[PDB]
Amino acid sequence: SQQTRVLQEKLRKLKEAMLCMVCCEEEINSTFCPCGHTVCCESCAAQLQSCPVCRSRVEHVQHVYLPTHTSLL
Amino acid sequence: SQQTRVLQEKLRKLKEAMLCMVCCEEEINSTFCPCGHTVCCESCAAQLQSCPVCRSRVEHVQHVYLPTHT
Numbered sequence A: 001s002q003q004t005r006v007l008q009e010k011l012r013k014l015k016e017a018m019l020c021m022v023c024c025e026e027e028i029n030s031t032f033c034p035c036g037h038t039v040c041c042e043s044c045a046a047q048l049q050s051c052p053v054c055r056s057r058v059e060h061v062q063h064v065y066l067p068t069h070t071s072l073l
Numbered sequence B: 001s002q003q004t005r006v007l008q009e010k011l012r013k014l015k016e017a018m019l020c021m022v023c024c025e026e027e028i029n030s031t032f033c034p035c036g037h038t039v040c041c042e043s044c045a046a047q048l049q050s051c052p053v054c055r056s057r058v059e060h061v062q063h064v065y066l067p068t069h070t
């Protein structure tokens, strides 16, 4: 029905919000510190000296173990 | 249709996985450091001495701004 298509869209948008904002291909699993923006995968976060959301300097990157994480397994 | 019900369930489960493992009422927005477990809201994370997932000592709590926040 039309509601099947609406639910498909909601699910797709929620899953897209879980993906790295830079590469769009890998799940978010890293936090820029100290600002706290958690919007990248580990590969993109290692290459940024400034937060892509707020432009604060990145002192270091903290890996995050989230419950929403999914993998090939 | 039955497909609408299947998608409703997938959405519900993903949203439930984003809630604090202690209170089950507030969204996750805090990380235990240095272990990195990000499973609690700010209120529940504030008084824990050890991580509720892996038992590592909590040196500090880092607030996280996630794109899934609603």
Ligand SMILES: Cc1nc(-c2cccc(N)c2)no1
Pocket (backbone or CB within 6 Å): A017, A018, A019, A027, A028, A066, A067, A068, A069, B017, B018, B019, B027, B028, B029, B066, B067, B068, B069
């Ligand atoms: C809340 C909340 N958001 C997430 C989240 C956000 C982006 C990516 C991933 N994997 C999880 N988990 O809990």
Ligand SMILES: [Zn+2]
Pocket (backbone or CB within 6 Å): A020, A021, A022, A023, A024, A025, A026, A040, A041, A042, A043, A044, A045
């Ligand atoms: Zn990336």
Ligand SMILES: [Zn+2]
Pocket (backbone or CB within 6 Å): A032, A035, A036, A037, A051, A052, A053, A054, A055, A056
């Ligand atoms: Zn930032």
Ligand SMILES: [Zn+2]
Pocket (backbone or CB within 6 Å): B020, B021, B022, B023, B024, B025, B026, B040, B041, B042, B043, B044, B045
């Ligand atoms: Zn809580």
Ligand SMILES: [Zn+2]
Pocket (backbone or CB within 6 Å): B032, B035, B036, B037, B051, B052, B053, B054, B055, B056
């Ligand atoms: Zn832990």
